[PDB]
Write a protein that binds this ligand. Structure first.
Ligand SMILES: [Zn+2]
Ligand SMILES: [Zn+2]
Ligand SMILES: [Zn+2]
Length: 158
C-alpha cells in the first residue's frame, strides 16, 4: 500500500540523517549521506531558518519531529531529536515551561533555545500531536516524493 511506501521512504530519510551524523568522511560516496551532510551543514550556518522559514531547515526539522515522535532514547545520534522530544512532551504535560525546556535554566542545550521555540513556529503546534482514532499522525506532513524535493529544489533568482 502507498502508506507503507511513504513510511518506508521517510524511514530511509531518517537512516540517511543518522548515517550523515555518525559519518566522518566529507567525500562519502552515498547520495543519502551527501544529501544529509550538506543539509545539516547548511542548517548549522543559515540565517533564514526561522525568518519566515527556510525550506531546507524547516523540512529537516519536520523529519526530526517525525523521528522524535517514534523515538524513546536518551542519547540518540539524531541532532535535534532529544530537545524536540522535550518540546513534544511539553505539549502533552510530560514536561514544564514554554520559553524554557524545563523549570531550571542550567539544563538547557548549548544552542540558545530562542531558536528552538522559533523552530516550533515552522511546524503546527497542535495538529501533529492532536487526539487520534487510528495511526496516521506521522504521514500527516510528508510524502514519498517530497523526500528528494525538500533538499534538491535549491532556491534561486528565477
Ligand atoms: Zn557517509
Ligand atoms: Zn536555511
Ligand atoms: Zn531519536
Amino acid at each position: 500500500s502507498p502508506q507503507e511506501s511513504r513510511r518506508l521512504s521517510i524511514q530511509r530519510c531518517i537512516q540517511s540523517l543518522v548515517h550523515a551524523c555518525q559519518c566522518r568522511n566529507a567525500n562519502c560516496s552515498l547520495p543519502s549521506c551527501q544529501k544529509m551532510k550538506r543539509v545539516v551543514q547548511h542548517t548549522k550556518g543559515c540565517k533564514r531558518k526561522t525568518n519566515g522559514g527556510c525550506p531546507v531547515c524547516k523540512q529537516l526539522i519536520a523529519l526530526c519531529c517525525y523521528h522524535a515522535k517514534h523515538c524513546q532514547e536518551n542519547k540518540c545520534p539524531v541532532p535535534f531529536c532529544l530537545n524536540i522530544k522535550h518540546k513534544l512532551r511539553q505539549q502533552q504535560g510530560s514536561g514544564s515551561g514554554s520559553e524554557e525546556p524545563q523549570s531550571d535554566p542550567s539544563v538547557e542545550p548549548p544552542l540558545s533555545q530562542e531558536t528552538f521555540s522559533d523552530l516550533w513556529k515552522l511546524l503546527p503546534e497542535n495538529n501533529v500531536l492532536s487526539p487520534l482514532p487510528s495511526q496516521a499522525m506521522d504521514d500527516l506532513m510528508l510524502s514519498p516524493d517530497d523526500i528528494e524535493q525538500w533538499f534538491t529544489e535549491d532556491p534561486g533568482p528565477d
